[model samples]
Target chain A: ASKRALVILAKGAEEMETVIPVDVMRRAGIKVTVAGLAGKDPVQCSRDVVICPDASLEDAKKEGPYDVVVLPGGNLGAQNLSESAAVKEILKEQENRKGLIAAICAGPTALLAHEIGFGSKVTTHPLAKDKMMNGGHYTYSENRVEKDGLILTSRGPGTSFEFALAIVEALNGKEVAAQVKAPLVLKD
Target chain B: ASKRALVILAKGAEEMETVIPVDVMRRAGIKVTVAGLAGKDPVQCSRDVVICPDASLEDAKKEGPYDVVVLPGGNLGAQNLSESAAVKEILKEQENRKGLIAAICAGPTALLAHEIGFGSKVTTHPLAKDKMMNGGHYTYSENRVEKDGLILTSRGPGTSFEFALAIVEALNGKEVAAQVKAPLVLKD
Candidate 1:
């Protein structure tokens, strides 16, 4: 059976972070959903590139029971996710069910806000460390990508491929992840 | 003065390639227009990501004489660009005026199709090498990113950041490119 993923897309999201995971996961044969937080409309990213989501959060939520929920990062985009009641509910549900919850760049801040994976080791873009470590809810690591049980965190756009491949390895296993990685021509 | 870039978007394009360059260039303070080849409509990329372009190619052409013209590659997408009469005219004019023309992955194949920059060394996705070299119009390179005068080419998704930064270095200089590269947390 193909694993399913939900990638929450909000305005001001980092286009690279969002696209990398979605594209890579699909390459790994995961059925990924790009759910728009603001509804199924075009979203202008942090750098002004616009993306049209596959479905609205409200719509995608009804269809989910996803294996992983991905949160992509940009300063303002993470802020939007951090402030959303909808997002809070989703993260809490995923955590309660012991599903994988992955975030990158400033995205880990939302985990802080929603109070998910409080004791897991995590990583975020260096610039977002102060915010993510505000109350020291989670242990922090400097590794590009860190996975502590069900919670996966990564640093920035530079680590997106690593972060995505980790998710694929977790969901589809190492061999599948390896198959997907080769065509991308990534530096090992 | 800020540089201007025109990224021609078509259906079946690689969303990663298209978004990476557009995002990185904007970070370098370049005015980048994501122009849709098939009118101003959302494009479904190779991996199923839908991108809403900034404007239609026909409309954007009126505003051009841009610093760089970028072609992002997916086999079908490059074929789309290669088959377009408008794209041929645009590349021929850009080459004639000594403007930079950058392409990546299978994108360089479009340059081959349009007969632009003959004799300039270039690189493309390994899978696309045979197609790009069908007539031996240009020399081949295995470099992650290759720049032969005004024609620039890169390999695949993994090299997108490098390729985008190379364009920044070309139009905005190394200092600006390095500044833009730092926040990206790209690997050396």
Candidate 2:
């Protein structure tokens, strides 16, 4: 069966961080749902690039048990994710199901906010580390992409490709990841 | 003076390729205009990612002599650019003025379509090499980011950061590029 990924998009999301994962996952043959937090309206990213989501979170939530859930970050975007009760429920359900959960940059902070995957070793953009480590809930690392069981985390936009490739590896295996990575001309 | 970049967004544009350069350039402090080719409506990318461009190409054309004009690629998107007389004028104007013009993946093929920059060393995604080398109009390169004078080109989504940073180095110098690169956690 084809794996499915849910990527939640809110206003102020990092455009690069969001698009890289979505594109690469599609290249890996994953079915990705880009769900808009604020209905189905176009989302204005941190750099002001606007993205029209595939569906509203309200609609997408009816589709359950995604193989992976991805979170892309900007400070304000993370704040939006942090505040959403829907996101909290989604994270809780994904965690309950033990499905993979991926977040990047300040994205991992939402994991902190929702209290989902506490005790997983995670990473975030340096600027977001302090907030992610608040109250010492999770062990943090500086690795570009940190994977602890079902939880995957990575740093900023620069690490997005690596972060996404890690998700490919986790779901599809190493060979699939390499096959997808080579065409993109990713450096070793 | 702040450098300006005009990124032409057409239907079927590679969302990753489109967003990465726009976000990275903005991070480098460049004033970037995401211009829609078909009007102000949202562009549906090759992988089905929808992007709402900042302005219509018709409106952005009046704002001229930008420091860089960036072309991102998807086969159909490049075809759209290739078919546009407006794009021809933009590329020609930029070329005649000796300003920088950049492209990625199959994007350089648009230059060939419009006869904009013949004889420059460039590259495309491996899959696009045959098309790009068809008439011997330009020299081919395997380098990730190929720069020959005012023409800058790169391979694909994986190399977008290098491509965008090269544009930064060209317009804003190495110091600014380094400053912008550091925070993004880019691998060397």
Candidate 3:
């Protein structure tokens, strides 16, 4: 059976980080739930693409002790994500369980506020590295994908594919991940 | 109508390069045809995933002349791509038309053999650059995605999303491309 993931959504979350992973993961046979924080209505990313989600975070709580939680980033969305009590609650639960938790770019700052990225080596969008520093032991990578334990971080849109592949590797194991990687002719 | 691309398949093609872009482009409404040159059987990529093609290259040619021709790189695939007379004819025709010609890693070497990258700024899967240089004004970017005119290239698996985005950027204009970029929370 495929591992399950909950992708948190905000009205202005970054879209590519969210969509690419969902697409790649689905292709890799993992189950993904687009969980919205505010409501069940369509959520908009920063640059403006509406994402209709699979479920609501509040409803998901009883339904999931999920394997992972993914937070995609945008400036205002990151701010909104950081301020949400419900999201904080989920982060705490994932941490308690040591379930994989990943945030890219500004999203990491929000994860840091919840103390998720602390003591871990990670990377984020160039403009937002200061915030990433606030969250954990930060290292800069030219490569988009950075793996730190159960936490995966990527530089930005450019890294989305690598980030998605990393997720596949994490959940589906190397062989299947290699299957996904092979189509694109991508290598480490 | 969006342009269609045929990915010429063979063994050892960089799996990430082929899969990531195809997924991104398809999601963005671009149609992709996975064309195998060696017949109707599946083409083996790096990690042993046999990618079953939707059609054979011979059949694809009957459907062509396609808007774009993409060649993925792996040690054997690149060599095979360069050697096939049918594949070469398409490259020559497309190169003459200045159509979008995309290659990643060793894939770029095929273009180099045809003298395509000459005087153009491009990048390849880091280490493969030496064998891939074809008189093009080349530079090495640790950055995943590299774009030069109608030719788009990426470094490795890490660069796949950006590589796909580059194609999307070429076909759909920047705004549509921005839609994918914003959610990814990554910028290059």
Candidate 4:
């Protein structure tokens, strides 16, 4: 069966972070859904790029049991994710199921907000460290992409390709990720 | 004065290529207009991400002489760009004015299609090299991001940040590019 991935698209999300992972995951042949957080309307990203998602989160959630749930970060975007009760339940379920939950930049702060993985080693954009480390509940690493079992985290927009590739490696395996990486001209 | 960028969005554009440069340029404080080639309706990218462009090309053309005009590539998207009379005029005007004209991946092939910059050095996705080099009208480089004066070109999705930053450095100066690059956490 084809692996499925869900990406939550909230207003003010980092467009690069959101698009890179979605595009790369599709390249790795994962069935990816870009679910809009606020209904099915277009999402205005942190950089003001407007993305019309595949479906509203409300609609997409019913179809899930995704292999991975992805969260892309802008401060306000992450805040939205943190505040969503739907997001909370989704992360909680994914965590409970031991499915991969990946986040980047301020996106990890949502993990902090939801208490998804209490003891996982993670990474976030440098600017978001204070928020993610508020109580030292989770250990922090500066690695561009850090995967501790099912919880994967990465830094900022610059690290998005690496972040996406990590998810590809995790879900689809190393061989698939390597094949996808070559045509992208990405640094190893 | 804020520098303005015009990104031509068309059906089958590479969503990662389109979003990365748009988002990164916005981070550098460029006023970017995502103009739809066909109309104001949503554009389906090569990987199937849908983007709602800010304006129609017909409308956006009236608002230019922009600082930079960006072309993001998917093979089909570039073909759309290559075939358009509107795009031909846009590239021609930008080139005549000596404004920065940027393209990525298969995008540079559009310049070849329109005969926009006959002798400039450029680069494109490795897979696109044959098509771009067919007429031998322009010099080609294997550099990830190639800039020969006002024409800027880059390879595939992996080099988008480098490509976008090069545009920032050209329009806003190195300091602004450096400042924008830091937050991205991009590879050095």
Model 4, docking class = high
Top candidate when judged by DockQ against the true structure: 4
For A21-133, candidate 3 gives per-residue lDDT tens digits of 76677678777788888877667665444456667888877788878788887778888998998888998989888889877767777877776656776777778877767
Rank by TM-score, descending? 1, 4, 2, 3
Angstrom error at residue A86, model 4: 0.8
Estimate every model's Cα lDDT from 0 to 1. 0.95, 0.93, 0.73, 0.94
Q: Candidate 4 lDDT, tens digit per residue, A108-186?
A: 9999899989999999999999999999999999999999989999999989999999999998899999999999988
Backbone clashes in model 2: 0
Best by lDDT: 1
lDDT of 4 by residue, B1-188 (tens): 88999999999999999998898888888999999999899999999999999999999999999999999999999999999999999999999999999999999999999998888899999999999998898898999999998899999988888999999999999999999888889878
In angstroms, the error of model 3 at A110 is 1.1
Over the stretch A23-85, how does candidate 2's per-residue lDDT look in tens digits? 999999999999999899889999999989999998999987899999999999999999999
Better of 2 and 3 by lDDT: 2
Runs off by more than 4 Å, candidate 3: A135-143, A185-188, B1-188
TM-scores of all predicted structures: 0.99, 0.97, 0.54, 0.99
What root-mean-square deviation over C-alphas does model 4 reach?
Answer: 0.8
lDDT per residue (tens digit) for residues A1-188 in model 1: 77999999999999999999999999998999999999998998999989999999999999989999999999999999999999999999999999999999999999999899998999999999999998889898999999999999999998999999999999999999999999898977
User: Candidate 2, after superposition: displacement of residue B142 in Å?
Assistant: 1.4
For every candidate in turn, the CA RMSD to the true structure comes to 0.7, 1.2, 10.2, 0.8
